Amino acid sequence: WGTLQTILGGVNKHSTSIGKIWLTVLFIFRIMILVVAAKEVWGDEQADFVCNTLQPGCKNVCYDHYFPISHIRLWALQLIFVSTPALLVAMHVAYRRGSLWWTYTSSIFFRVIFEAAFMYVFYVMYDGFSMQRLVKCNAWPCPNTVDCFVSRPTEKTVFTVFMIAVSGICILLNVTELCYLLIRYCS
Amino acid sequence: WGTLQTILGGVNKHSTSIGKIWLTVLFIFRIMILVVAAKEVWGDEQADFVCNTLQPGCKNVCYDHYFPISHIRLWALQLIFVSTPALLVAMHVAYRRHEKKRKQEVRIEGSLWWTYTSSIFFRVIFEAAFMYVFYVMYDGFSMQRLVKCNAWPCPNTVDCFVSRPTEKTVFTVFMIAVSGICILLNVTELCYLLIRYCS
């Protein structure tokens, strides 16, 4: 998109001190990582999924059972969910240019909730942050238990720790922006 | 076997008028057909059993379901079963003849009645039992080109194709027809004896 400078710049103008630091983390360390490096790592997620079996359809059900949602698809959804509250406030500030307190605090509160929900979903669904080389599968029509092997498990572990750590930082930065605002009014 | 002439000749001597006809039909038109022709018709029965499927093990269980006992193996068992009552009596005839000489048309006089009559009666029952098994197990005497199979692990119903069904049908009809002829010949020998003693 050739208008990225305009929309990012528009958010940049209508932002506080920390809010400008938060924007550089979301765009440079999260959007670019998901676009230039991570999206190609997951290219052959199912094509290079190898199962030690002769059963037709066993590979399809086993990959589906262990990867109900791809990692890169989860991060694409999370990025969009933590992007609407910031832009909606930014558009409202532009329209205003009082009531801004109840929107700016709400957007920060919503972003923290969204970021913690996705991180929780990542942990519970994928039983940790480490991808295993071998998955044992016993769903129909696979006979007994079938051994299957994941494509690039180590590459995916490095990029998932990187994304989780950055999201953890975004939680901390949004907490301080609440602490800065909380002491102004109710303290 | 090199002693076939010996045993066939020995059985031939110790037999009645009709019983010698029964020997030719048994050996020429049942044993020779089974050995010379029939056995190699069934040689590739499972090798070219073809099933339209990708499921491992489906071919194994579908062939087993539809051919629990092979036709030629069924005929081999039947031939052995209907040969012993004839050979045992023929051996007993030699012993009876041995006793008289130690003191060539076979005639039944004394205890030979209850052995010969039983041997004829057993061979009729053995042949009918095998003919009944052939009909019941294979739902008739015609092999089908296509069999539909749904035993585990085959998914839903699988189409499978038999090797040389027409040639197998031709030899099945031939073996059953000859077996029925042997039954008719055996019943006549019962009729010949049944009017001598009890009539």
Side-chain angles (χ1 to χ4, degrees), chain B:
Chain B
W1 205 2
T3 84
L4 292 190
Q5 186 272 307
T6 303
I7 46 190
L8 296 177
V11 176
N12 197 1
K13 313 310 173 180
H14 308 300
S15 293
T16 41
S17 153
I18 277 191
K20 299 177 194 296
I21 310 175
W22 190 90
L23 258 281
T24 88
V25 196
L26 176 125
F27 157 103
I28 293 187
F29 287 93
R30 281 218 269 187
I31 303 195
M32 260 285 135
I33 318 297
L34 184 73
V35 164
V36 158
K39 234 189 153 143
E40 52 142 316
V41 176
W42 270 262
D44 58 345
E45 46 192 346
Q46 178 159 49
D48 325 293
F49 197 72
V50 175
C51 290
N52 191 345
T53 188
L54 269 176
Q55 175 69 40
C58 181
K59 175 192 163 163
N60 267 18
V61 314
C62 288
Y63 179 87
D64 189 67
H65 177 270
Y66 274 100
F67 303 102
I69 181 47
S70 177
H71 279 60
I72 54 153
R73 248 91 73 199
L74 256 201
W75 287 319
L77 288 169
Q78 152 160 228
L79 283 204
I80 292 162
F81 266 85
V82 308
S83 285
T84 68
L87 254 73
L88 289 207
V89 153
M91 167 249 267
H92 182 232
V93 166
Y95 145 81
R96 191 125 167 170
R97 174 216 45 72
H98 223 313
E99 199 280 308
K100 281 190 178 185
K101 288 187 169 169
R102 290 178 271 190
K103 276 206 188 178
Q104 303 176 359
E105 293 190 3
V106 167
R107 162 75 60 171
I108 275 63
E109 57 282 67
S111 100
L112 275 195
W113 177 274
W114 292 121
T115 87
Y116 205 86
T117 304
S118 277
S119 104
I120 304 305
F121 185 68
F122 261 66
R123 263 153 29 181
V124 173
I125 285 196
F126 279 164
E127 290 239 278
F130 272 97
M131 198 180 293
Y132 169 78
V133 165
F134 256 105
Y135 183 64
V136 154
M137 164 159 339
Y138 289 118
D139 89 329
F141 309 122
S142 287
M143 202 140 285
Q144 298 303 296
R145 273 175 180 167
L146 163 85
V147 287
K148 295 210 187 289
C149 174
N150 64 346
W152 193 87
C154 303
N156 319 305
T157 308
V158 160
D159 278 1
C160 298
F161 298 90
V162 176
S163 173
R164 324 153 173 274
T166 300
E167 192 167 39
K168 282 174 191 173
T169 297
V170 162
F171 277 95
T172 298
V173 167
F174 193 78
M175 292 291 277
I176 300 309
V178 168
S179 218
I181 280 165
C182 280
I183 289 175
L184 284 198
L185 280 186
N186 273 181
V187 172
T188 60
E189 254 206 298
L190 282 177
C191 279
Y192 265 37
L193 284 40
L194 248 284
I195 78 180
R196 287 283 174 283
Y197 253 48
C198 293
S199 308

Side-chain angles (χ1 to χ4, degrees), chain A residues 116-131:
Chain A
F118 273 91
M119 274 190 44
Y120 173 66
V121 158
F122 253 102
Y123 183 88
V124 61
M125 167 177 300
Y126 283 119
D127 57 333
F129 303 118
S130 268
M131 204 155 268

